[PDB]
Nucleic acid binder design. Structure first.
Ligand SMILES: Nc1ncnc2c1ncn2[C@H]1C[C@H](O)[C@@H](COP(=O)(O)OP(=O)(O)OP(=O)(O)O)O1
Ligand SMILES: [Ca+2]
Ligand SMILES: [K+]
Length: 430
DNA sequence: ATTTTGACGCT
């Protein structure tokens, strides 16, 4: 009891831009705003592959990974914006720069960990302490939380969505103990106030809307974020975890969406996160390893300790292209030309990165996939990255991979290459 | 024939 940790020591948010690439294109082209629309890369093969979908179009069943021709079958009036193409490949620069806009705004409020192009974790513990000092026992008005849901409420003894939201928020605020500055529920509530302010600032200064989760750790904040989308935020309190987890499929928890989550389900014969509480820590370590077992034992109780890392910039800068089916690279000239295209984009982005961020990459990673291999990467080799020069980087990549060619004819390449990948890594300050 | 990314763990 008095010594049992409860994982209530931090306030952590996860901010997720809503359908981000779509919003970037809608800001640029007002004709696309408030319409069913999607972002597509390439156009020749089946109308192009959809990579982002507005919520209006999701209502028709349009999803990412879908071909645009098929999406048009579900949504005949679907509007499309195309990813820019440069040097023969999709170029994501517009979205990376929009991401920087948002991340720099978020960084004014607190330390952020860039989780993806449109996702950041936020460590709010210190900001919440300061705001609590400013408030001086003053109660928190529901007006300060105009887009916040409290997971699990309302409960106990209106048929509209906003009415339910307000009822749950009212119950939560009515129960709060505003006089205890160490109260974890109060701390989460102040965190939610700050996140409302952050999201307002993002929308005012960029036009972009986002959703957010607020809880005591990254996994719960990420889970909370997806409960009420778009353009809303959700507070998941420690006390909400038993009911929330009691029907929560294991695969919905971050890092359990793949093979490990499948093995948890299969070996233990369970379906929901809460069922994990019935195993000892040693049982879980015996099945899943020391690290995973301890992590699951704590996580099914709502407890997780992974820190928000102070990192606003990506650790790697990479460029890749697939060559599916008939397009697989079968000559040496082809392989070298595409290595050159990838290296030119990489040099452009690296030079910009060096000027913006006072750092230099020192390692070049080359990855390839051969036709027939089911794995995404068949081979990975590295060489020194000593000059931001595309011809040198492409020549070096060719040198490290050229011995993979089985073909006895020098001009021909076999087995054909279905993927090329150049990644600059190992940054040092400059 | 999703494609193009990015982070981290194991050995
Ligand atoms: N599998 C993918 N392939 C290519 N691009 C992707 C892929 N997944 C995501 N992206 C890009 C496009 C998205 O706008 C952006 C953010 O991804 P993601 O958060 O999963 O969806 P989303 O922002 O489009 O919608 P949501 O509102 O549900 O968050 O990253
Ligand atoms: Ca998103
Ligand atoms: K996401």
């Amino acid at each position: 009891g008095p010594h049992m940790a409860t994982g209530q020591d931090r306030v952590v948010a996860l901010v997720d831009m809503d359908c981000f690439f779509v919003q970037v294109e809608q800001r640029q082209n007002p004709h696309l705003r408030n319409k069913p629309c999607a972002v597509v890369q390439y156009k020749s093969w089946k109308g192009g592959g959809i990579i982002a979908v507005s919520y209006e179009a999701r209502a028709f069943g349009v999803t990412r990974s879908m071909w645009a021709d098929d999406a048009k079958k579900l949504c005949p009036d679907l509007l499309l914006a195309q990813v820019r193409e440069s040097r023969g490949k999709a170029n994501l620069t517009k979205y990376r720069e929009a991401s920087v806009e948002v991340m720099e705004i978020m960084s004014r409020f607190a330390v952020i960990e860039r989780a993806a192009i449109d996702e950041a974790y936020v460590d709010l513990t210190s900001a919440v302490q300061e705001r609590l000092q400013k408030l001086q026992g003053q109660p928190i008005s529901a007006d300060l939380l105009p887009s916040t849901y409290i997971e699990g409420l309302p409960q106990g003894p209106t048929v509209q969505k906003e009415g339910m939201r307000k009822q749950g928020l009212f119950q939560w605020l009515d129960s709060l103990q505003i006089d205890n500055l160490t109260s974890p529920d109060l701390q989460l509530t102040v965190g939610a106030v700050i996140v409302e302010e952050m999201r307002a600032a993002i929308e005012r200064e960029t036009g972009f809307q986002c959703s957010a989760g607020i809880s005591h750790n990254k996994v719960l904040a990420k889970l909370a974020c997806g409960l009420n989308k778009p353009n809303r935020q959700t507070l998941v309190s420690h006390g909400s975890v038993p009911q929330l987890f009691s029907q929560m499929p294991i695969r919905k928890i971050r890092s359990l969406g793949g093979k490990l989550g499948a093995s948890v389900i299969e070996i233990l014969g369970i379906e929901y996160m809460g069922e994990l509480t019935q195993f000892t820590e040693s049982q879980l370590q015996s099945h899943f390893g020391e690290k995973n077992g301890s992590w699951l034992y704590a996580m099914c109780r709502g407890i997780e300790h992974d820190p928000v890392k102070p990192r606003q910039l990506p650790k790697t800068i990479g460029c890749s292209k697939n060559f599916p089916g008939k397009t697989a690279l079968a000559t040496r000239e082809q392989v070298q030309w595409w290595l050159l295209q990838l290296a030119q984009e990489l040099e452009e982005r690296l030079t910009k990165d060096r000027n913006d961020n006072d750092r230099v990459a020192t390692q070049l990673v080359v990855s390839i996939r051969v036709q027939g291999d089911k794995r995404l990467s068949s081979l990975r080799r590295c060489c020194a990255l000593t000059r931001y020069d595309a011809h040198k980087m492409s020549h070096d990549a060719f040198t490290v991979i050229k011995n993979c060619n089985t073909s006895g004819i020098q001009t021909e390449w076999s087995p054909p290459l279905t993927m090329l990948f150049l990644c600059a890594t190992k940054f040092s300050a400059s």
